[PDB]
Design a protein around this ligand. Structure first.
Ligand code: NAG
Ligand code: NAG
Ligand code: NAG
Ligand code: NAG
Ligand code: NAG
Ligand code: NAG
Lengths: 198, 118, 113, 391
């Protein structure tokens, strides 16, 4: 229920391949979409092939993934100067050894132990009894292709054209009866208009 | 059977600092449970700490907090550890087992470490 | 079995009397699965709300029919003229409580001139 | 921290029958005078209902838990605010995020936080003689409240709370679904007052709540309300007070059905596509009336059950143990050319083994292998110390 204003996307530079349009060609900021879900997250940024269709990755094996739909935005700008501690970025961290190919849109928050050996944690530490949470510890001087990157993905899920999330600056008065095309709330079509009750 | 070597131990004045080495020759290169163990005189063997091979995860027991930090080297296939605040009951023998695919706590011989002013 | 370097039995297009290539090889017969369709016999919604299910080729109140195993309609000794075809010379209808019956089709009024 | 208040008396549940409920439009779209099929999560035409005797002062004390099982279909007709909320969570502790739904006469508060849950949580209310009203003061249902993420407050929309005495003359409905990291709660209120427990009403629910949450859940419990009773110290009563209420319990399963729209866009009459042959023949034909004759439907196919394999056993008899046994080679200086081809080349020797280090690549499923023919298994004879394995 807002104005979206995707024109800001064309600003700045870097980012990455959209690789998800999946509707049809013409103009960008006309349709009202259905629901805009922003799920920005920060990874090592070494490889973003997991966010691409197919090509399951290490992080996406237990984290954000699009099963087969995508159609979204995978804009991901490179930035190492910001949110980088001089003595290692211990704030960012990730969870590992969580099963294999979990459900895409299902998040979990728990540690326990994967029990990959023979002796579980049983509420205490031990060998092969690590809680699945490893500190990233990004270093300000650790490579360029491995430095942390900022990536935000969008759900889209285009099924309902007349929705509330659209903010084109064009405004026109309503037509009662003229054989003209209509673009109300992102829905396009042609015909004649007639008023009735329902 | 697995070969484990431990060296550098001996007498140290109280509140010292030791740098022992555990050179693990090979080890199936599938480690998941690298950790050290101690056996105090007349005291049963207890867990000390552990270091993951696929991550920087280093769990520590309650009694070794702060004063104990262990590390490894994927290039060197070794296990180093640094000590602080040596107190008389820390006088015991330590070991560095290798727990891997099938490999149990690949036990070795350890080294005697003495914490006394004599 | 017939000869060593060739054992996969198959005769026309798809029977393939073998499995793939067992170490004991040799071939016996084929029976993976074989079953057919189904149709529903109704007399009319404004007439009744009960029906009769007729299967296509199933070795089954169950009544066997060469056209297919039909369940939900009993047969009779005699025969009448029918309008709901079933095939294989037998047809079903609605005869008065009230139930659907299936019978051998009658040819006509016999009379020797 | 927590006080255990349980009862040793237990009574098995009772079952009943459910008529035509559990129906909704597949999409938010609107349609008139056109028939359309539908395949999604619904509830069949005939089923059973499970409601517990939550009356204890004859008496029955039963406060069990219900597994999630991918959404639970609910319906209640409470009058004295018996069902207060629903606590969710596999472990029901501070390590898992739970849902706290509280409804009152002023505002509707929906909080999703990690409230600490005791063994037997229950909410109690009192009755002040001077004020001549009921309020809440025993907020002991939660011990700790941390990690607050969601907090929604709104006015009561579909709740009137005007009638002072209503003898089961209401029908509130809830639909629960946990798909794609969401927990949708659909609201539906229709006035009903009949003789039987379940009338023949039929009206689809209308979407009102689309709150998301991502977590694996397989267990939850429904909360309750208690009224304090003034008891003398020497009375020695049970100490538990409760009213009269019940709640249906059901579960979800994806099937396909049929819907028919009306001139007003509401499903008036619908046939159950997978109920019986008479309605099965209406799955293909788009009419609710059929004339006499033969009508074909979906074919009858028997799916196979046993699926097993029979692989070769001997073939070529131990590719490496015929001359080298498990592992034994000659002197290092003699690198004799010895290769075995057209053989099994199985890897039964390295499965158990003892220590060793291998070539540290194992590209395809390490330690599984045994899926490629390979040209040969030529094993050169040599011995090295092995400590310098990196060299
Ligand atoms: C439930 C119902 O009948 N709704 C409307 C009714 O109000 C209206 O008067 C008439 C249309 O002419 O039928 C329809
Ligand atoms: C094992 O192989 C032998 C072939 O020598 C033969 O008996 C058969 O094909 C297989 N099964 C058994 C049970 O022997
Ligand atoms: C069914 O039969 C009755 C009586 O024979 C007749 O009145 C009616 O029009 C028929 N059709 C329907 C749809 O009821
Ligand atoms: C059909 O079933 C009957 C009864 O068991 C059996 O005698 C008959 O052989 C079956 N038909 C075939 C083709 O096997
Ligand atoms: C047909 O006649 C036989 C001969 O007695 C009898 O056994 C059978 O029951 C009859 N069929 C029916 C449907 O009555
Ligand atoms: C060959 O190895 C096996 C163990 O895999 C065992 O029989 C023995 O060690 C060897 N055989 C002989 C005859 O020495």
């Amino acid at each position: 229920n807002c104005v979206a204003d995707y024109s800001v996307l064309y600003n700045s530079a870097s980012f990455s391949t959209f690789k998800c349009y999946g509707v049809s060609p013409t103009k960008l900021n006309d349709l009202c979409f259905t629901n805009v879900y922003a799920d920005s997250f920060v990874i090592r940024g070494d490889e973003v092939r997991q966010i691409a269709p197919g090509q399951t990755g290490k992080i996406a094996d237990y984290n954000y993934k699009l099963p087969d739909d995508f159609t979204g935005c995978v804009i991901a700008w490179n930035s190492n100067n910001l949110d980088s501690k001089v003595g290692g970025n211990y704030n960012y961290l990730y969870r590992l050894f969580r099963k294999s190919n979990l459900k895409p849109f299902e998040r979990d928050i728990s540690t326990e132990i994967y029990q990959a050996g023979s002796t579980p944690c049983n509420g205490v530490e031990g060998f092969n009894c690590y809680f699945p949470l490893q500190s990233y510890g990004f270093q300000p001087t650790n490579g360029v292709g491995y430095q942390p990157y900022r990536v935000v993905v969008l759900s889209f899920e285009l099924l309902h054209a007349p929705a509330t999330v659209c903010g084109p600056k064009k405004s026109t008065n309503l037509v009662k009866n003229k054989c003209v095309n209509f673009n109300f709330n992102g829905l396009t079509g042609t015909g004649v208009l007639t008023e009735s009750n329902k | 059977e697995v070969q484990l070597v431990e060296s550098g131990g001996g007498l140290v004045q109280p509140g010292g600092s030791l740098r022992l080495s555990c050179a693990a020759s090979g080890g199936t290169f599938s480690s998941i449970g690298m950790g050290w163990f101690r056996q105090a005189p007349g005291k049963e063997r207890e867990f000390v700490a552990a270091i993951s091979w696929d991550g920087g995860a280093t769990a520590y027991a309650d009694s070794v907090k702060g004063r104990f930090t262990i590390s490894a080297d994927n290039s060197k296939n070794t296990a180093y550890l640094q000590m602080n605040s040596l107190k008389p009951e820390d006088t015991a023998v330590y070991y560095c087992a290798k727990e891997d695919v099938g490999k149990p706590f690949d036990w070795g011989q350890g080294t005697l470490v003495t914490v006394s002013s004599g | 079995k017939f000869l060593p370097f060739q054992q996969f039995g198959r005769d026309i297009a798809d029977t393939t009397d073998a499995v793939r290539d067992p170490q004991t090889l040799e071939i016996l017969d084929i029976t993976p699965c074989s079953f057919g369709g189904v149709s529903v016999i109704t007399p009319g919604t404004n007439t009744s709300n009960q029906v009769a299910v007729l299967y296509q080729d199933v070795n089954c109140n169950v009544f066997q029919t060469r056209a297919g195993c039909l369940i939900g309609a009993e047969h009779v000794n005699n025969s009448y003229e029918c309008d709901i075809p079933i095939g294989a010379g037998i047809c079903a209808s609605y005869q008065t409580s009230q139930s659907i019956i299936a019978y051998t089709m009658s040819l006509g009024a016999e009379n020797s001139v | 921290q927590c006080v255990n208040l349980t009862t040793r008396t237990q009574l098995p549940p009772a079952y009943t029958n459910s008529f035509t409920r559990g129906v909704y439009y597949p999409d938010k779209v609107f349609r008139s005078s056109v028939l359309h099929s539908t395949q999604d999560l619904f509830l069949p035409f005939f089923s059973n209902v499970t409601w517990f005797h939550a009356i204890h002062v004859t008496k029955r004390f039963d406060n069990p838990v219900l597994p999630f099982n991918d959404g639970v279909y609910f319906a209640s007709t409470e009058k004295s605010n018996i069902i207060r909320g629903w606590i969710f969570g596999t472990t029901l502790d501070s390590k898992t995020q739970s849902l706290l739904i509280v409804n009152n006469a002023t505002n509707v508060v929906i909080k999703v936080c990690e409230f600490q849950f005791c063994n037997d949580p229950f909410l109690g209310v009192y009755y002040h003689k001077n004020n001549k009203s009921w309020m809440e003061s025993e907020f002991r249902v939660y011990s700790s409240a941390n990690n607050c993420t969601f907090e929604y407050v709104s006015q009561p929309f579909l709740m009137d709370l005007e009638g002072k005495q209503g003898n089961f003359k209401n029908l509130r409905e809830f639909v629960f679904k946990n798909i794609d990291g969401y927990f949708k709660i659909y609201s539906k209120h229709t006035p009903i007052n009949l003789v039987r427990d379940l009338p023949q009403g039929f009206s689809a629910l209308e979407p009102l709540v689309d709150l998301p949450i991502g977590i694996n859940i397989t267990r939850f419990q429904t909360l309750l309300a208690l009224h304090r009773s003034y008891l003398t110290p020497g009375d020695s009563s049970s100490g538990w007070t409760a009213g009269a209420a019940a709640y249906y319990v059901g579960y979800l399963q994806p099937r396909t059905f049929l819907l028919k729209y009306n001139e007003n866009g509401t499903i008036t009459d619908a046939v159950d596509c997978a109920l019986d042959p008479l309605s099965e023949t209406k799955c293909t034909l788009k009419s609710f009336t059929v004339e006499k004759g033969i009508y074909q439907t979906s074919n009858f196919r028997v799916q196979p059950t046993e699926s097993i394999v029979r692989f070769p056993n001997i073939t070529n008899l131990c590719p490496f143990g015929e001359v080298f046994n498990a592992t034994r080679f000659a002197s290092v200086y003699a690198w004799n050319r010895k290769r075995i081809s057209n053989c099994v080349a199985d890897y039964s020797v390295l499965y158990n083994s003892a220590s060793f280090s291998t070539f540290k690549c194992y590209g395809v499923s390490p330690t599984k292998l045994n899926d490629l023919c390979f040209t040969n298994v030529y094993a050169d004879s040599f011995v090295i110390r092995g400590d310098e394995v990196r060299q």
